Design a protein around this motif. Sequence first.
Motif: not given
Ligand SMILES: [Ca+2]
Lengths: 546, 546, 570
Positions: C129, C197-198, C231-234
Amino acid sequence: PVQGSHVEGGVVEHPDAKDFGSAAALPADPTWFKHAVFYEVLVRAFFDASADGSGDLRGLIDRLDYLQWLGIDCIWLPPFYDSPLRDGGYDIRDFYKVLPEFGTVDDFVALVDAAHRRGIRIITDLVMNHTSESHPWFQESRRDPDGPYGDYYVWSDTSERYTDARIIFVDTEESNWSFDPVRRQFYWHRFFSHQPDLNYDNPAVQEAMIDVIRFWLGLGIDGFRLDAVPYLFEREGTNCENLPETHAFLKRVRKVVDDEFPGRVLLAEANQWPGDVVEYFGDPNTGGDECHMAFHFPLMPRIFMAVRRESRFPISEIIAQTPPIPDMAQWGIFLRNHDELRRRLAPLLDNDRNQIELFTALLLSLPGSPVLYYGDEIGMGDVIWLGDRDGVRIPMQWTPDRNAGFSTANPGRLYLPPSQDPVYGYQAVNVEAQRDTSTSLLNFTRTMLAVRRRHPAFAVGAFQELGGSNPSVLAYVRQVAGDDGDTVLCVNNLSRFPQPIELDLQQWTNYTPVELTGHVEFPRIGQVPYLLTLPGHGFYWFQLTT
Amino acid sequence: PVQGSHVEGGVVEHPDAKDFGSAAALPADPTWFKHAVFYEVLVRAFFDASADGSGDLRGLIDRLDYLQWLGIDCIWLPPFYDSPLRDGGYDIRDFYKVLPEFGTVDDFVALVDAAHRRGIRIITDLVMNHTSESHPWFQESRRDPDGPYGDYYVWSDTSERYTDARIIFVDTEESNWSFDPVRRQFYWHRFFSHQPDLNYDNPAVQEAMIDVIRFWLGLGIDGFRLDAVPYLFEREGTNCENLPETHAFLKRVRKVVDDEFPGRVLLAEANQWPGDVVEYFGDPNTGGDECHMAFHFPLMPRIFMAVRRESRFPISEIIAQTPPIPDMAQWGIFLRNHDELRRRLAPLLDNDRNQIELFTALLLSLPGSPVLYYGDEIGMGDVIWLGDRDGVRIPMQWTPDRNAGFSTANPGRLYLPPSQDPVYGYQAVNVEAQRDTSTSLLNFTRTMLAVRRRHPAFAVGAFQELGGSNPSVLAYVRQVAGDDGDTVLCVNNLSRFPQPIELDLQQWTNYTPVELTGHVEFPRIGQVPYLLTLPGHGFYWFQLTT
Amino acid sequence: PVQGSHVEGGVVEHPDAKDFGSAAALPADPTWFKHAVFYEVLVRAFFDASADGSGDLRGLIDRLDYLQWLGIDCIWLPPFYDSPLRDGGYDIRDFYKVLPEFGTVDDFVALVDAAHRRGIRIITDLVMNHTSESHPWFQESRRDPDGPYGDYYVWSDTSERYTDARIIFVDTEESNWSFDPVRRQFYWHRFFSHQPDLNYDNPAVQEAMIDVIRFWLGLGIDGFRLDAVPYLFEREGTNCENLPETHAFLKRVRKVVDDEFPGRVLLAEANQWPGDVVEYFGDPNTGGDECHMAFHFPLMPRIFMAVRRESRFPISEIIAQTPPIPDMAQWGIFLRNHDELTLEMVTDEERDYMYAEYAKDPRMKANVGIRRRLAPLLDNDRNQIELFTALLLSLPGSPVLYYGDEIGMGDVIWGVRIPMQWTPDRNAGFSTANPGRLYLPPSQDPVYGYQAVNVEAQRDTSTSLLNFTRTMLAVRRRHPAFAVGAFQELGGSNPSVLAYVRQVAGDDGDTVLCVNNLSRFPQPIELDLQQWTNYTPVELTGHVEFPRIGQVPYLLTLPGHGFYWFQLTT
Ligand SMILES: [Ca+2]
Ligand SMILES: [Ca+2]
Ligand SMILES: [Ca+2]
């Protein structure tokens, strides 16, 4: 088999020196003992190599690097002969076998070799007056009185013989005669009932003992302390101590030693006043024809008294009062006052390092050959839980880890646990923690030892106690005879507070004192009282240079 | 309730000094800080009385006997105010409450009383520049900007303001502005992002802080070190350090202090070169109208350098180079070189006791008021496992028993375990083992402290560095003005080896040096170079008598 | 140079797997993770071979004979990537270099080679993440927004965005947007400010990251626990957790792994209730097309509650409410209630009936947040240590043992990451270096310290906790039913006792019986074993034959906190 002594059929057979490998000998030096610093070390206490909880010969061999690094000249080992151990190994069961617990005779040869290769000599105790009940000679004496060993010990039908001779161990023994169950006769013993005295009137006994000496010397040992020698002979109507027959036998033992094994040392175990003990050096005209060394006992308690009184006189007096000794002779000196018959150095001085260092300076600069006791170099303590002789005999404190780094065996299999004393225990005082701190007790004594070696005047020089106005300060010069000879000056403050001294050094006018520790030149000596100044319990060593 | 500060309805309410019992005050003495020996002690580390693994105020009260016995004059406590503890307690959540872990304010009153009854004064840190995010003022400032606390902190819509002002914690912080989530504006902080700076341009902020001072002084505290004072004010186009507005505020704080609580002390926390730091004493003509004390930082590293070079010059130079200070002013001196911003004394000198004792002699004889750090008197160490500030903050090593005698609670509930370091750990170095050995580090520093007290010349005397032929030896006289005034002579050997010194003491011809430790009279001074002699790292203290 | 990652001159250049020696892979077994007992070990804490005071990869290699002897199938390493260590190495500064303290990539290859030759596998963490602040990608992103790495992170001009997302670390952080000093824009962080965050919305970030996987898989590693994956994508208007796009990405990762490096494992780190976590296994219709494994968190708190309450109900219930999982999937089980990427015990208001109960029990309350090792957790009670270990080793899933639990090590407080206790001698046999220079001092605790508890002491004595753990491990290996068997809880007249059967489907299939006494007092139980009439129980530990099962309910008898393991033979 080479290891052990065996009785068959009625004669006690022992292995000769030829039966074992000969260790490498050290170049002949007649007066090596004069320059030697001795290190007394208990085998059982030093290092355990076999991992059985008791230190051994193999364990000692490993620690020779440490000893050489420390800079000691000879290792002195308490008795390690085969024994039932009813009296700490002084009750000898066999003269021709190492106690199996400590190893074999081959292990001893490997010690004498490894130590020699490092230029370090070996000497051991050899109990002379008596053996153990367990010794085959006594077992043969009590069984066949008409056999060859029947006259090896002193036998009597009555106890009313050799009266007026004192009983040594008054607490335990009630008489010097003990009724043997088998032979149904009384026998003589100045020590314990299980330690029957040899009959030295018997010529076979003399030779057998000279052969015991011949054995260990053949293996390569550099000398002995001869134990209980004041009690060898006994004659009716005397106190049975220090008899002419005793001295004459020792003279003969010397003659043999000098002839067959030249360059070895003979020390006399005698707990007595100097002037009484001086007899054991022999005839002065021969230059010494008995023992090379005897101990100076009152020295250490005089040093102590001097420090408590803050006055040099107790020390200067016993030195002035010490009888002169022959050329081929030396006083053995050490920081203790009990033999057999204790405390240790550090706890005796309430752990005051400056005071320890002062006592150590004294030890290394006063006339004679110093003897350090294993662990004094790191300020080890004693244990009351064991009482006297067993209380000082605790394992060497190398590290603050498990077993103090002395053994890898499970704590519980140990002969004695290392002391966990809050001040002197192995967590508080140990080799590892002191090897790196430059001013540690350990590195201090290594420095003095090193310094002492470069100055023969400390070992064999004359002694001139100078006089100062200040009674608290002891100053003296050690000088080797001859122009451009080694000349050192030692100034010691016995007071716990800083002191000034004026010294009359007119005898060395225009000489330059060079402090030995750091080679700093001090003001040159004039026709004037030479002023020095010292903090509480400090000392200076100088070479006087021309 | 008296304990705690509470917000209602829009105003932060705090208890006044009257709400608590007043501790017994000590007779007014304007220049007590000149003669005082300070002892800095971390509450959490000293003694745990509640048995919870962290030391407390009640625990300190118990150990006052020890401190008085040791002979220190004032106790200095790092911050103990209520805090979330994100920065070791320097992030203050409430100025009017003791951290619950350490006790209540009533416990502090009981400390100030018990210590006063023993003639020992108390001072604490008081963080001035900033508070914690957790402080109610900031929580009110960020919520209601139009409320009374809206202008308590520095707020900006942009980050491009007060450039050229350095970022202190370069490792962590990237800017001196932090974007607040709630108020949606930037705020100022010279330290951590959770430590917002007070806006000292606001007159309400000034008064509120003068009231915080008024509070603790009312309780009975003898003074403060005022933390982060070089960073109080900020002005555009500068480096925001040491500004005229900052100095003027401190002058006003002094005026209040002198009026309302006469005889208290104000120390300035400023990590800077002397001559730069000298500003914080104020105007010389007033005799000092700012802080009473500031610290002399380069002293200790100069002492160290002198010992490594074996040369007095690094020490004599910074003293000669030290700017003169006003009458009602003193240099705070200590054997460290880092504040915020460490090591401890013993491990820095590789545990060399003579060297420690030398540094300690210097500390107690050089110009200024010495500050000892808890445990220096017994040669405690640091711990790397914790790193810098937490590594020095280990529990006091009283005994070699469980928890080092610091806590009776189960080991595991402790805040930090006592060090089991093989050399500096509690088994190796502790109070119990050193209280009885006369020459222990502990008894040495007690002796010097006692000696120093009988001689005001050490505290408030002039400084005359004499000159000797020997560069290795630092000698100086401390003299109180006036006929028959206290006059002491201090001779210190920086070399690791014995050294001779000739001193030109013609200024005190026919005076008699009397050594302070044992009252031994030394040769009287003539028209001639006075010769003394010292072992490696030794020192002498003399009173010059008439 | 082969070691490190460098920016030359505007592009961050990294070495490939071909640049290093290739470690020998084991025979491809796609279902090995089901049969594996994992051993989790801090590299820093295990063994110091370089004599620097810190544990290293070379040290771990020396200790493989011990691990093989103990009988663990796979070693699990916490992050060992290059890092400034502001958050336990979970803040990765470089994916392509080993943290110098532990050694190099070349040491790691040798470890995989030495492990495989003994039949042992290696898995590690991989944070997905976020990277560290100090990462070259972030330094370029903040410096040149116009460059290739400008869109590698999430940048906004306002903090008022994604306002529906919670703050994970409420104590340290107050917003998920941190304002950068250089770029002058807010950046998104789900964790700490130094962990940006990436931006997975960027196709280049995805490909770059799956390349990181390709790198280590190519070196020889058998798997990762993919960290912080929820939590990768927002997305605006969402809570930013568990978004379909996040799952989609993971499916692509599984796709690549299966294709390119067949027979490895992917574990989902997610501090969630089971039932929420089950999504990370992927589409069941596939057999599982996302992560192979995920941890069952409420297990051990429920076991703990069961023991204190002396009732099987808390254990029974969570097994009963555990959702079925895809064919190619496994629960990971361990004696802890949350992982290192969160502060508090995983729980659930709606679906956990014991939700409010954990706090009402004093001994349990002191274990909600604090991570303890097994022995201290249970007041050094041998019977309970053995009971929990039996549970962990016989309940459904793949068990994870923590290093040192096998000798019953303890904690410190300032602390489960203390040096491994090999011997009762200097440094606990961990290092030959000076005691002062060690990363942490070996526990000298009077009860849990290295003098009282260590491998050497316990390896010899047959009664030791080490020899218990080894026997259990050896017994379990002989029985696949423990690893891949079905679970059937048995009817019994006494709720103080938890009894169940593990059965492999098919004739002559492996069948074991486990009986566990939750009471501190001796208890009788009559079991409904009619399903196995004529079967004979043979106690697994000493091969003692117990009475043949009849039609009558079967009686067993246990002392306080006892347990039995049996094979039901025919
Ligand atoms: Ca993220
Ligand atoms: Ca006799
Ligand atoms: Ca400010």
